[PDB]
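Notebook B, p. 112. Complex prediction, attempt 2.
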Amino acid sequence: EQACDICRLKKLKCSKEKPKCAKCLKNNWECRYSPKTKRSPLTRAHLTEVESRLERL
Amino acid sequence: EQACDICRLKKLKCSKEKPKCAKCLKNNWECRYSPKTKRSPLTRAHLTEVESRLERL
DNA sequence: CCGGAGGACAGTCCTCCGG
DNA sequence: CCGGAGGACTGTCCTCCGG
């Protein structure tokens, strides 16, 4: 499912074949399929927490 | 057709029948269907705008 | 090139059961 | 009194379309 970094960067269709996907292979570009990087919980708790820690001070 | 506030904080079934749902008619209580609580948007930019604006204090 | 559909999915948001 | 289950809804987050 996870398209590579470069087709990601590019908003294109990845073929998804590890080691180097079709376009990287053929273009001798680095095929890195990087991890999905973690964000903050987008939870009503964490929004009103932090929008009220801020507006308080 | 939304529950009234007494049944609401008592977590009871409402008949939602305006102006007086059955329990407040039967029981002679003030019935109020106070309106849609507006909140801030649990969207990503607003979470981020705000923790950035707190990380900046 | 890159905004946006398309959509599966996460976490809300109210309600009322049943202990 | 209330924990949290059930369900519609809201917005996400990912990918790849299509001008």
